Structures are given as structure tokens and as C-alpha cells.
């Protein structure tokens, strides 16, 4: 059974089982091309593949570019093999992913960091081309070697940027995992406190906040509740602009600017597909 993966210069311990063919699954280690995501049995077979493989980045269209950070839009119908390999790779670190074969109804947004050898996988999120429940993310993953550096929140922010340009309100697919929920709550906290910091008016509706942020009204209310900013005072519902929360937020978003871990809306070059 697969315990480790060789991925570029990294050796990654796998967390959950992924349904690779038994010919590959019975081996202890899998070697993968870091650009095309094809999986191989040995270091020797990988070396020979890397000499021949023409891919230095994901397929599809580069829709975001800020220096070394890119996002590629990959259509599951146009690049089926790449997207299946990506889903099999994702399933090694995602427990609850249940889709690896029929990738045709999905778009995959693949974030990369460039160096002099090519554009290296940071993480991704998948998205239904047409979601009945208006889900703007299906699954989301930061690769283990990049985790806890701010890239997950960049991916989340990017998913809402797409929703903003589409003139839609979005939400992640249910159910949300433990780590997913922690990440989304941090993001929703940031966006809400940003809005209220910049808003000068005397009142605001949840719908107005939802329209500007592309965040679902239920998620806004949930976040308002989590921050204890919804109060009651003689008959009416009231948004409490908490002192301590906005102070710490400015200190936090100073650090966010310093480390460059932000998605810049002006660096998106995108019109919705089809």
C-alpha cells in the first residue's frame, strides 16, 4: 500500500487511501511527474519520463498571474487525464473526496509557484460547471509541503473573486471538513471585519454584505454569531462593531501584506467559460 509519494524535490507521506490501480497501489512509493501528474513505479522510470515530458505547467488557460504565482483554469472534459490524476493525487490527502473518474462536469483551478524549472503545484480547488446549489468550490487542497503558509486562504479568496466576476453568490460544497471549516471561518472573519472597517454608514443589510463579498448570507450570519457581533437591545437586531476584533485584524492584515500572501484582483484575466 502507498505510504509515500515522490513529487518533484519533495517526498510526501500519504494520509488516506486513493484508488490507484493495484499494480501501482501495492507498491510502497509512487513517483509522479510534478507537471503532468502521471504516476510511475520507480525513480528510473520517472527520470526517463522527465527527459521526454513537454509539460512545465498545468494545461488549460492561465487566468491569474502575479509574478511567480499563477492560477490555471483546467476543463475536466478538455484535459480529462490530467484532472483524473489530480483527483487521485488529491484523494491521498483528502478523506472525503468521492470523485476521481467523471471529471467532465468540473473545472479545476490549479495554483502554482514558478521557479527556473517551471510552474510547481501549490494547491487547487475544483468547481462544478453548473451547480444547482450555487457551490463555488467542490473540493480544495493545499499540497502538504505548502500547508499553513497562507495559500489555502488565497485559494478561498480566489474562489470568491470568480463568483464576484460571475455576479453570483457562492458557498463551499457541504459537508465541510474540520480543516476546511477552520479555514473558511478565518476567511469569513477577515472579509467581514474588512467590510465593516471600510463601511461608514449607520446600517447595513446582510444582502448588501453578501452582494459585495460574494459570500452567502447564511455564512455571513454564522460568522457574525461566531464573533459575537449580533446583539439584542429592546426589540431589534444590531451589528456590534467590536473594538478588540478590528484592532487585532489591522495587526493581522499588516502581516498578510508583509508576506505577499494575497490575491490581487487586477491580476485576474478571465471571462466565465461557456
Amino acid at each position: 500500500m502507498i505510504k509515500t509519494i515522490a513529487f518533484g524535490r519533495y517526498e510526501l507521506d500519504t494520509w488516506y487511501h486513493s484508488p490507484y490501480p493495484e499494480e501501482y497501489a501495492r507498491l510502497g512509493r509512487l513517483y509522479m511527474c510534478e507537471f503532468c501528474l502521471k504516476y510511475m513505479k520507480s525513480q528510473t522510470i520517472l527520470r526517463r519520463h522527465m527527459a521526454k515530458c513537454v509539460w512545465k505547467h498545468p494545461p488549460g488557460d492561465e487566468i491569474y498571474r502575479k509574478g511567480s504565482i499563477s492560477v490555471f483554469e483546467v476543463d475536466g472534459k478538455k484535459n480529462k487525464i490530467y484532472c483524473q490524476n489530480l483527483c487521485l493525487l488529491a484523494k491521498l490527502f483528502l478523506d472525503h473526496k468521492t470523485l476521481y473518474y467523471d471529471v467532465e462536469p468540473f473545472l479545476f483551478y490549479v495554483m502554482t509557484e514558478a521557479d527556473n524549472t517551471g510552474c510547481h503545484l501549490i494547491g487547487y480547488f475544483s468547481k462544478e460547471k453548473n451547480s444547482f446549489l450555487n457551490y463555488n468550490v467542490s473540493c480544495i487542497l493545499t499540497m502538504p509541503q505548502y500547508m499553513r503558509q497562507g495559500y489555502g486562504k488565497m485559494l478561498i479568496d480566489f474562489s470568491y473573486l470568480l463568483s464576484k466576476v460571475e455576479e453570483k453568490v457562492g458557498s463551499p460544497e457541504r459537508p465541510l471538513s474540520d480543516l476546511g471549516l477552520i479555514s473558511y471561518r478565518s476567511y469569513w472573519k477577515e472579509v467581514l471585519l474588512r467590510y465593516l472597517h471600510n463601511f461608514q454608514g449607520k446600517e447595513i443589510s446582510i444582502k448588501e454584505i453578501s452582494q459585495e463579498t460574494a459570500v452567502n448570507p447564511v455564512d455571513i450570519v454564522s460568522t457574525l454569531q461566531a464573533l459575537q457581533m449580533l446583539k439584542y437591545w429592546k426589540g431589534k437586531h444590531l451589528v456590534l462593531k467590536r473594538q478588540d476584533l478590528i484592532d487585532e485584524w489591522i495587526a493581522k492584515e499588516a502581516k498578510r501584506s508583509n508576506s505577499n500572501k494575497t490575491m490581487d484582483p487586477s491580476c485576474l484575466k478571465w471571462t466565465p467559460p461557456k
Binding site: 447564511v218 449580533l230 439584542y232 437586531h237
Partner: peptide, 27 residues
């Protein structure tokens, strides 16, 4: 277009379309 869950042991029901008043510390 409503939502519910308790605030300080009191179950409440909030509209998403109505303007909600924004407050600082106060009383």
C-alpha cells in the same frame, strides 16, 4: 429570507434584507 440561532440564551430570528443598525461599545 430568515435565519435563527440563540444569542445569550434567547432564540432569535434575523432578516437578511432589513437594514441592521451598527453600534460601537455604548450601553
Amino acid at each position: 429570507g430568515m435565519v435563527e440561532i440563540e444569542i445569550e440564551g434567547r432564540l432569535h430570528r434575523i432578516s437578511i434584507f432589513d437594514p441592521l443598525e451598527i453600534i460601537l461599545e455604548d450601553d
